Amino acid sequence: MLEDYAISLEEVNFNDFIVVDVRELDEYEELHLPNATLISVNDQEKLADFLSQHKDKKVLLHCRAGRRALDAAKSMHELGYTPYYLEGNVYDFEKYGFRMVYDDTCDKKN
Numbered sequence: 339m340l341e342d343y344a345i346s347l348e349e350v351n352f353n354d355f356i357v358v359d360v361r362e363l364d365e366y367e368e369l370h371l372p373n374a375t376l377i378s379v380n381d382q383e384k385l386a387d388f389l390s391q392h393k394d395k396k397v398l399l400h401c402r403a404g405r406r407a408l409d410a411a412k413s414m415h416e417l418g419y420t421p422y423y424l425e426g427n428v429y430d431f432e433k434y435g436f437r438m439v440y441d442d443t444c445d446k447k448n
Contacts (some may be wrong), residue, residue: 339410339415339420340408340411340420340423341421343411343420343421344408344423344425345349345366345422345423345424345425346424346425346426347424347425347426347427347430347431347434348418348426348434350386350398350424350426350434350436352371352373352398352424352431353373353436354396354399355373355396355397355398355422356373356374356375356395356396356397357371357374357375357397357398357400357424358374358375358376358377358385358388358397358398358399358400358421359371359376359400359405360376360377360378360379360385360400360401360406360407360409360410360423361378361379361401361402361428362378362396363376363378363427365402365428366442367441367442367443368376368441369428369429369434369438369439369441370428370438370439370442371400371436371438371439372437372438372439375388377410379401379406379409379410381412382410382413382414382417383412385399385414386390386414386417386419389414389417389419389421390415392431393394393419393420396422396425397421397422398422398424399411399422399423399424400423400426400428401423401425401428401429402428403425403427404423404424404425404426404431405425407423407424407425408423408425409413410431411423414447419446
């Protein structure tokens with residue numbers, strides 16, 4: 339099913355989808371996309387909640403590599419949802435042209 343939902347970084351348009359950061363708090367804080375919602379790959383109740391708010395939407399679960407993108411998305415497809423997922427290095431988004439917010443744990447000032 340979701341093999342077709344496997345969006346690559348060299349074809350992606352993060353602006354076109356509602357993005358979800360499927361990793362961890364620390365991972366999200368060190369860097370993330372300005373349209374990425376923090377949910378962990380283990381947060382099935384929180385991920386399914388976000389998808390249950392409206393099932394009719396286009397959401398992209400992006401991962402630092404792409405495996406947690408797949409992991410989280412399969413589990414959701416098994417709960418009767420159909421989210422997409424991004425396989426591509428989180429650090430490479432900026433050089434592919436997609437701006438990113440580094441250090442949002444509080445603010446990047448001292």
